[PDB]
Amino acid sequence: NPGQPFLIRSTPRGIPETVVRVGRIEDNFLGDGKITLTVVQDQFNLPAT
Partner 1 sequence: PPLGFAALEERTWTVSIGTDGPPVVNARIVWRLQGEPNLVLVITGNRIIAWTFAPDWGDSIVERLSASTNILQSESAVTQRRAMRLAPRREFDANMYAVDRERQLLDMTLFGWGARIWALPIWPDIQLLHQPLAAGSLGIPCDTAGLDFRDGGLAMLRGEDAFTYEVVEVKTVTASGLDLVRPVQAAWGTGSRLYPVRTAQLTEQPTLTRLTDTAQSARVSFLVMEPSAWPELMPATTYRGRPVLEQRPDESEDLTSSYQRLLSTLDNGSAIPRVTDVAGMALPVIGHRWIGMGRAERSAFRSLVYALRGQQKPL
Partner 2 sequence: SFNSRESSLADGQPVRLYQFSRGAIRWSYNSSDRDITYQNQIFRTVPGGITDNGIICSGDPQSDQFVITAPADLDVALLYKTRSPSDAIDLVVYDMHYGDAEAAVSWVGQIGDVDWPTVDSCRITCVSEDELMDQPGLTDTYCRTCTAIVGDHRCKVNLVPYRVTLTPQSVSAWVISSGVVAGYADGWFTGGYVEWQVDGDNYDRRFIEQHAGADLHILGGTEGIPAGGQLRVYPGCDGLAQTCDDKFSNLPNFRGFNAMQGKSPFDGDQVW
Partner 3 sequence: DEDSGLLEITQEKTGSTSLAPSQLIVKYIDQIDGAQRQIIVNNNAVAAS
9 binds partner 1 (CB under 8 A): no
- Out of 2, 3, 14, 33, name the contact with partner 1 by CB under 8 A: 33
- Out of 2, 14, 31, 47, name the contact with partner 1 by CB under 8 A: 31
Radius of gyration of the chain (CA): 14
For partner 2, what does the binding mask look like between residues 10 and 39, x meaning CB under 8 A? --------------xxxxxxxx--------
What residues are paired with 36 via a beta bridge?
26
Question: What span, in angstroms and rounded, lies between the C-alpha atoms of 49 and 47?
Answer: 6
8 binds partner 3 (CB under 8 A): yes
Question: What span, in angstroms and rounded, lies between the C-alpha atoms of 38 and 32?
Answer: 18
